[PDB]
Design a protein around this ligand. Structure first.
Ligand SMILES: [Zn+2]
Length: 41
């Protein structure tokens, strides 16, 4: 925290909730996630 960069960010799925060490890992996970938009309207 003193000697270095503070904070951290990870590619966590904001749909089901899944952390991915790699960036592509999440991108490929989006495949199963096919539903961008409302349903009851
Ligand atoms: Zn997901």
């Amino acid at each position: 925290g003193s000697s270095g960069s503070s904070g951290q960010r990870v590619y966590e799925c904001q749909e089901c909730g899944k952390s991915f060490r790699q960036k592509g890992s999440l991108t490929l996970h989006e495949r199963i996630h096919t539903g961008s938009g409302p349903s009851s309207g």
